[PDB]
Amino acid sequence: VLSEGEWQLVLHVWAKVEADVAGHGQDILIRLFKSHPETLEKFDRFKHLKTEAEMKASEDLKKAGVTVLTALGAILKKKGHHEAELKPLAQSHATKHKIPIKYLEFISEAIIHVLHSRHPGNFGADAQGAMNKALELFRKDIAAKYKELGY
């Protein structure tokens, strides 16, 4: 459970992302792919991309970044009341895309990495704490649906 002050922090951080959704989302996916190459293999849509330059130049990767962050942004703004929004993502990711929960931990770390990279001196220690908590809560709640389905 996050406090109100912690959710306020999360959403102030998210306001930074909303100023350049496609940029943050592309950066997040690139970091994920480069740090954890097994993640890229799950995307028939992107597995042609070999080099970071190709990833950076991929307009479709930007579009995927918008899609991901649009969904995560809406989720965060529910401030934990996100059962309706998580259900379809659990189903798709566990059963169709075959994404292990470990890879959600990896994308969570990518988010923190990219926020630090883009906002040096402006991503506060309190904010990092709160954002970690929010992402932990998301993973816990998705993980429960995975467990249900045998994943």
Give the interface with ligand HEM as residue ranges (CB under 6 A): 39, 42-43, 45, 67-68, 71-72, 88-89, 92-93, 97, 99, 103-104, 107
Tell which residue, 107, 98, 123, 89, has the closest CA to residue 34. 107
Nearest residue relative to ligand HEM (C-beta): 92
Question: Do 127 and 9 meet the contact criterion of CB atoms below 8 Å apart?
Answer: yes
Minimum CB separation of residue 98 from ligand HEM in Å reads: 8
Which of 86, 127 has the CB closer to ligand HEM? 86
Minimum CB separation of residue 121 from ligand HEM in Å reads: 26
Give the whole-angstrom CA distance, residue 146 versus residue 33.
23
Which of 101, 119 has the CB closer to ligand HEM? 101
Instruction: Fill in the DSSP letter of residue 124.
Output: -
Residue 87, classed as helix, strand or coil, is helix
Query: Alpha helix locations (H) across 36-100?
Result: 37-40, 52-57, 59-77, 83-91
Which of 59, 120 has the CB closer to ligand HEM? 59
Which of 4, 44 has the CB closer to ligand HEM? 44
